[PDB]
Amino acid sequence: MEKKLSDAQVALVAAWRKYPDLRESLEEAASILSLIVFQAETLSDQANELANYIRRQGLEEAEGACRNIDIMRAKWVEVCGEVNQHGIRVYGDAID
Amino acid sequence: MEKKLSDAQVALVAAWRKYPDLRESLEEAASILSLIVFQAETLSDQANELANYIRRQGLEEAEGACRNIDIMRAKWVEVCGEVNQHGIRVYG
Ligand SMILES: [Br-]
Ligand SMILES: [Br-]
Ligand SMILES: [Br-]
Ligand SMILES: [Br-]
């Protein structure tokens, strides 16, 4: 349960497997987690694209912020992984 | 549930209320969710700043991207709320 998105999803499934009365509750909760992750990944992609633009234009004044974004995105993938081309969220060295 | 970060957090708490053995489990889960909300808001703020820079430079090429960041930030606040000046996450 080492701080990965997969652990939190797994723990919620486990609970409504032990106690089926929790299923509606905790499934709406997993749905919200999923929506939160989705929205974050949408904005993150937009920010990355904006950073690509700033670099392509040789706009060096904003380079620090563009680096920050890289680090933040890299930190995100450590916790949440990355959805591959087949639409499956994968982690670690299963990414490359 | 109204599909808000707060509604989801409660469902997690409520569950280990009915069933205390779930507590280590679901609270670790809540920890991960909070970390996720935190990391997303850190990046979001940074992105907003980048858009601010681009708007102070009058660069109309990237303006669509800036309007996009604004739209998705407003949507974020719909689900996750927003921390007011007193350190309390509030919704609307
Ligand atoms: Br939270
Ligand atoms: Br962090
Ligand atoms: Br600026
Ligand atoms: Br509120």
Author numbering:
A (entry chain A): 1 to 96
B (entry chain B): 1 to 92
According to the publication:
One mechanism by which phages and other mobile genetic elements are able to overcome the CRISPR-Cas system is through the expression of anti-CRISPR proteins. We previously reported that gene 34 from Pseudomonas phage JBD5, which encodes the protein AcrE1, shows anti-CRISPR activity against the type I-E system of P. aeruginosa strain SMC4386 (4). We show that AcrE1 binds to the CRISPR-associated helicase/nuclease Cas3 and that the C-terminal region of the anti-CRISPR protein is important for its inhibitory activity. In summary, these experiments demonstrate that AcrE1 functions by blocking the activity of Cas3 without inhibiting the DNA-binding activity of Cascade.
Here, we report the 2.5-Å-resolution crystal structure of anti-CRISPR protein AcrE1, which inhibits the type I-E CRISPR-Cas system of P. aeruginosa. (a) Crystal structure of the C-terminal 6×His-tagged AcrE1 solved by Br-SAD reveals a predominantly helical dimeric protein. AcrE1 displays an elongated dimeric structure. Each monomer is predominantly comprised of three helices. Helix 1 (residues 5 to 17) is followed by a tight turn leading into the very long helix 2 (residues 21 to 57). A short turn at the end of helix 2 leads into helix 3 (residues 62 to 80), which terminates close enough to the beginning of helix 1 for a potential H-bond to form between the carbonyl O of Val79 and the amide N of Leu5. Residues 82 to 90 form an antiparallel β-sheet that protrudes at a 90° angle from the end of helix 3. The final 10 residues of AcrE1 are likely disordered, as they were not well defined in the electron density map and could not be modeled into the structure. The large dimeric interface is composed primarily of 18 hydrophobic residues from each monomer that are greater than 97% buried, forming a single hydrophobic core that spans the entire length of the helices. The structure of AcrE1 is not similar to other previously determined anti-CRISPR proteins, and searches using the Dali server did not reveal structural similarity to any other protein.
